[PDB]
Design a protein around this motif. Structure first.
Motif, PDB file in Angstrom:
ATOM      1  N   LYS A   1       0.816  -1.213   0.000  1.00 53.29           N
ATOM      2  CA  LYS A   1       0.000   0.000   0.000  1.00 53.29           C
ATOM      3  C   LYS A   1       0.849   1.261   0.000  1.00 53.29           C
ATOM      4  O   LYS A   1       0.538   2.197  -0.719  1.00 53.29           O
ATOM      5  CB  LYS A   1      -0.998  -0.001   1.164  1.00 53.29           C
ATOM      6  N   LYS A   2       1.925   1.283   0.791  1.00 52.00           N
ATOM      7  CA  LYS A   2       2.767   2.484   0.889  1.00 52.00           C
ATOM      8  C   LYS A   2       3.459   2.761  -0.439  1.00 52.00           C
ATOM      9  O   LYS A   2       3.564   3.916  -0.850  1.00 52.00           O
ATOM     10  CB  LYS A   2       3.779   2.391   2.041  1.00 52.00           C
ATOM     11  N   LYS A   3       3.884   1.689  -1.109  1.00 53.85           N
ATOM     12  CA  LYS A   3       4.524   1.770  -2.423  1.00 53.85           C
ATOM     13  C   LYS A   3       3.565   2.260  -3.503  1.00 53.85           C
ATOM     14  O   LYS A   3       3.887   3.163  -4.272  1.00 53.85           O
ATOM     15  CB  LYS A   3       5.117   0.401  -2.810  1.00 53.85           C
ATOM     16  N   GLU A   4       2.381   1.663  -3.539  1.00 55.78           N
ATOM     17  CA  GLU A   4       1.358   2.002  -4.524  1.00 55.78           C
ATOM     18  C   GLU A   4       0.814   3.426  -4.362  1.00 55.78           C
ATOM     19  O   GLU A   4       0.719   4.174  -5.330  1.00 55.78           O
ATOM     20  CB  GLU A   4       0.204   1.012  -4.428  1.00 55.78           C
ATOM     21  N   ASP A   5       0.464   3.794  -3.130  1.00 50.56           N
ATOM     22  CA  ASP A   5      -0.253   5.033  -2.871  1.00 50.56           C
ATOM     23  C   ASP A   5       0.655   6.248  -2.783  1.00 50.56           C
ATOM     24  O   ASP A   5       1.862   6.110  -2.628  1.00 50.56           O
ATOM     25  CB  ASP A   5      -1.128   4.879  -1.620  1.00 50.56           C
ATOM     26  N   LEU A   6       0.071   7.438  -2.892  1.00 50.79           N
ATOM     27  CA  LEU A   6       0.847   8.677  -2.944  1.00 50.79           C
ATOM     28  C   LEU A   6       1.481   9.145  -1.631  1.00 50.79           C
ATOM     29  O   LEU A   6       2.226   8.406  -0.982  1.00 50.79           O
ATOM     30  CB  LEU A   6       0.006   9.801  -3.538  1.00 50.79           C
TER      31      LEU A   6
END
Length: 171
Positions: A166-171
Motif C-alpha cells: 500500500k505504501k509503495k502504490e499510494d501517494l
C-alpha cells in the motif's frame, strides 16, 4: 445522549516503563502484536524469544510488538515497571517497547487493553495472550498462550506485506 466509543487501539495514551505518557498514535499505519507479559512464569522464556524473533523479522518500521506487563496471572510480574524493562533488555536484548505494568482484569482495567478485550470478546486468562492490531487500530486476530509462532507468523507477514504494498502504490 449516546456516549461515544473509542474506535482504535492507537487512540489511547499509556505510560511507558519509566512512567512517561506515550500516545499510541505513533503506531498508526503499522501492524501491532499486543501481548500481556510477565517475567516470572513458565511461559516467559519461549515468549520473549519468540516475540524477539517476530519484532526482528518484521519490525520496526511497519510492525511492532507492544508489551504490557501485568501481575494478575499467578503474580508473575512482581517487580517494578523499570526493572521489568531491564529484565527484558538484559536477558533477551529486545528492542520492542515494554510499557508500564497495568491491570487488565477487574474494576481498574487499562483502557487501551480493555479495547482489545472488548473487540475480540476474549479477556486474558493467563500471561501472554496476544492480539493482532491492523494499521487502522482494529483487532483482527487473537491467540491463546498455548499457540506457537508457526501459526502467528503468517498472519503478521500478510498485514506487513500489504502495509508495504500500500505504501509503495499510494501517494
Amino acid at each position: 445522549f449516546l456516549k461515544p466509543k473509542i474506535n482504535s487501539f492507537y487512540a489511547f495514551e499509556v505510560k511507558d516503563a519509566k512512567g512517561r505518557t506515550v500516545s499510541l498514535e505513533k503506531y498508526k499505519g503499522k501492524v501491532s502484536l499486543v501481548v500481556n507479559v510477565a517475567s516470572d512464569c513458565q511461559l516467559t522464556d519461549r515468549n520473549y524469544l519468540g516475540l524477539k524473533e517476530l519484532h526482528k523479522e518484521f519490525g520496526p518500521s511497519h510492525f511492532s510488538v507492544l508489551a504490557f506487563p501485568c501481575n494478575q496471572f499467578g503474580e508473575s510480574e512482581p517487580r517494578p515497571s523499570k526493572e521489568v524493562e531491564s529484565f527484558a533488555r538484559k536477558n533477551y536484548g529486545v528492542t520492542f517497547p515494554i510499557f508500564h505494568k497495568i491491570k487488565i482484569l477487574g474494576s481498574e482495567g487499562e483502557p487501551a487493553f480493555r479495547f482489545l478485550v472488548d473487540s475480540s470478546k476474549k479477556e486474558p486468562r493467563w500471561n501472554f495472550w496476544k492480539y493482532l492490531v491492523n494499521p487502522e487500530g482494529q483487532v483482527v486476530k487473537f491467540w491463546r498462550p498455548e499457540e506457537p509462532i508457526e501459526v502467528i507468523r503468517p498472519d503478521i507477514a500478510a498485514l506487513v506485506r500489504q502495509v508495504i504494498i500500500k505504501k509503495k502504490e499510494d501517494l
